[PDB]
């Protein structure tokens, strides 16, 4: 993994600063081999090249000590200061990548406080990153990360910082488009549905310019999603239909299980069961083809709920599956869907019970953190 | 403060291995063992292999 390789390069650097030769050599070797077995991103390749150079500098500064009597040798700790002093630009760049990659690794480990701390250290080193497009890429990645951590305001703020830089270049309309997608998804979490739609629409027009099938489709899907979240089911249908058409014309297999799911569910909810069934059959098949584990179970769930009675025992297995996967947001939503199914059927005892399930799920620790070395 | 792997190198030194024998035992180049010792000896503040062995043992 790109994320794990960067963290190994981090460890390599810590051994280099200590002049621990065996350790640094072992990591250097393992890292070279791992990168020889992959097409690494440009950021990772550069970080490695920098560290390779820095490792050779370590050896170069050590070399004169070989011929020195011991008392004439400087303390390694001072050698290190000299290196950092005479190679200030290298060091700063290394600090930027070290912290960025450690932050990414911590995020991956779901260590959120730790990720933020490293992301901030990285940002303070951004001055060493000259290319303003590379800066925008950092802000863009911060935006995606805080979208994931649901620090919605910070996510929008970083998207704005990225957008401002992309706006000044002409060859980056695609990234600009994705900044709009970032604004939209954030608006969506804020329930600002019209604002989200409006940005998805902008993104759409841009993706159509760039003739980008995937983005075009996703954009259309997200609009349908917004409509669906407002329970405006009829209004969502045409957008889901258009998205599917786009995905299907090109052969974007990965996107299809999803594109078929909400529209299938909608037709169940609208009581359009023959149409539901056809969407279901197709969506289920696409999921089987792509080998999509999650969507297989979710299409299965639609049957369990809308056709099978409902089948509460199968629904329960599904709920447990989602939870084991930490798909809490979907789990809440599906429990609501079950509650609402029973509600319309005037089965209020069952509805109330699933509404209770919803609250239980909202009580789970979904993104817990840990303080670093704070005494209680 | 030696890493476990640096201690390992020193342990082989105490047993009387040559640099070449340490290299082979640890799958490192001899050159790397030389660098390692220069670093290790500096850290132990000693000026010889024999004397690194003594400070090691205390
Ligand atoms: Mn490669």
Residue numbers in the entry:
A (entry chain A): 6 to 381
B (entry chain B): 153 to 210
Please give me the paper's original passages concerning this structure.
The complex interplay between the response regulator ComA, the anti-activator RapF, and the signaling peptide PhrF controls competence development in Bacillus subtilis. More specifically, ComA drives the expression of genetic competence genes, while RapF inhibits the interaction of ComA with its target promoters. The signaling peptide PhrF accumulates at high cell density and upregulates genetic competence by antagonizing the interaction of RapF and ComA. In contrast, genetic and biochemical results show that a subset of Rap proteins, including RapC, RapF, and RapH, are anti-activators that bind to the response regulator transcription factor ComA, inhibiting its interaction with DNA promoters without affecting its phosphorylation state.
To begin to determine how RapF inhibits response regulator binding to DNA without affecting its phosphorylation state, we solved its X-ray crystal structure in complex with ComAC to 2.30 Å resolution. The crystallographic asymmetric unit contains one molecule of RapF bound to one molecule of ComAC. RapF consists of two distinct domains, an N-terminal antiparallel 3-helix bundle (residues 7–72) and a C-terminal tetratricopeptide repeat (TPR) domain (residues 92–381). The RapF C-terminal TPR domain contains seven helix-turn-helix (HTH) folds that assemble into a large superhelix. The RapF-ComAC X-ray crystal structure reveals an extensive protein-protein interface that buries a total of 1,845.7 Å2 surface area. In sum, the RapF-ComAC interaction buries six of the seven ComA DNA binding residues. RapF-ComAC contacts are mediated only by the RapF 3-helix bundle and linker region. Thus, the RapF-ComAC X-ray crystal structure reveals that ComA binds to a RapF surface that, at least in part, mimics DNA. First, RapF buries ComA DNA binding residues in the RapF-ComA interface, sterically blocking the binding of ComA to its DNA recognition elements. Second, RapF binding allosterically weakens the ComAC dimerization interface, inhibiting the formation of transcriptionally active ComA dimers.
